[PDB]
Every structure is written in structure tokens, then in C-alpha cells.
Amino acid sequence: EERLRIAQYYENQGIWVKAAKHFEQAKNPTKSLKLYLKAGDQYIDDMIDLVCRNKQQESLQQTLLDYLLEGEKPKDPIYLLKLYDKLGNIQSLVKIAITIASDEHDQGNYKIAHERLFETYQKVKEHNVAIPFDLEQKLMIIHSYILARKYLAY
């Protein structure tokens, strides 16, 4: 009942790492997302838990996505993909995964691209959504190249 005063007086003490998390437990999703916007990348997972806890609001996920779109340079795709999957949209998952896998394929890392495409294929299969043709075609081509290399090794 008295969360807001505790959070305010704790923020007035000069610290802002634990008071920001307290604003989350203050039954104030707006303040929660507003302060979590300025937090780090490692804290994002916790906000995803908040998405599991406060499904009424829709601005938190949108603004987290907006802040992470232009955040620094491209990062580990699987983190963004799993957080979008927890959000519940798989088409953007396939799109981003295909983009990153194509980048790796052009860089020459066929194994990493194949692994990421297989992971995306399995994730799509779990959600019972029809597998996009481009994803399957790229996975088949890379798998065929890997099999050809393995058979040439024999």
C-alpha cells in the first residue's frame, strides 16, 4: 500500500539501481517501463517477466522494441528472437532469423547459419505455424552443402 513513498525516499538517497526495481513492484507498470527503458541490456529479461505479469499494457513491449532497434550495433539475435517469441509474434522471428543467417552464410559461417535456421525451424514447428518457404529452402541448401562436404570427406 505504501510502495510509492518507499521508492521515492530510496531514490532520494542517490541510488537508482534497486529503487527502479522497486517501482516495478509498486503496482505502477507505467513507471516500471519508463525506468526500465533507461536500464541496461541484461535487465531486459526481467522486463520480459513483467510482460508475463502485466499483459494489460502494450506500450512496454513496443517501447522496449523501439529502444533495442537502434541500440548500439547488432547483437546476439537469439536473445531478441526469444523475447519476441515470449511476446507472441513468429513472422518477425522468421524474418530476423533469416536475415542473420544470410549474413552468416555470406560471411562463410555455414555451420552457425545452419544451426540458427534449424533452431528457427523447430521454434516455428512448436508454434504450429506453416513453415515459410524461404526458411526451408535456405536450410535445405545449407544442409545439402554440409552433406556434400561430409560425403566428400569420406
d(CA 40, CA 145): 40
d(CA 30, CA 33): 5
d(CA 61, CA 55): 10
Q: Write down the experimental method used for this entry.
A: cryo-EM
Q: Scanning the structure block, which residue is given the C-alpha cell 513491449?
A: 61
1 closest CA partner among 21, 20, 19, 28: 28
Nominal resolution in Å?
4.6
Q: Which three cell numbers stand for residue 50?
A: 513483467
3-state secondary structure the chain: CCHHHHHHHHHCCCCCCHHHHHHHCCCCHHHHHHHHHCCCCCCHHHHHHHHHHCCCCCHHHHHHHHHHHCCCCCCCHHHHHHHHHHHCCCHHHHHHHHHHHHHHHHHCCHHHHHHHHHHHHHHHHHCCCCCCHHHHHHHHHHHHHHHHHHHHHC
Q: Which three cell numbers stand for residue 133?
A: 518457404
Q: Which three cell numbers stand for residue 33?
A: 517501463
- Kindly provide the b/e burial profile for residues 38-61, where b requires at least 16 CB atoms within 10 angstroms of the residue's own CB: ebeeeebeebbebbeebeeeeebb
How many CB atoms are located within 10 Å of the residue 107 CB?
10
How many CB atoms are located within 10 Å of the residue 15 CB?
10
Is there a contact between 67 and 37 (Cβ–Cβ < 8 Å)? Answer: yes
d(CA 113, CA 117): 6
How long is the chain? 154
97 closest CA partner among 149, 136, 43: 136
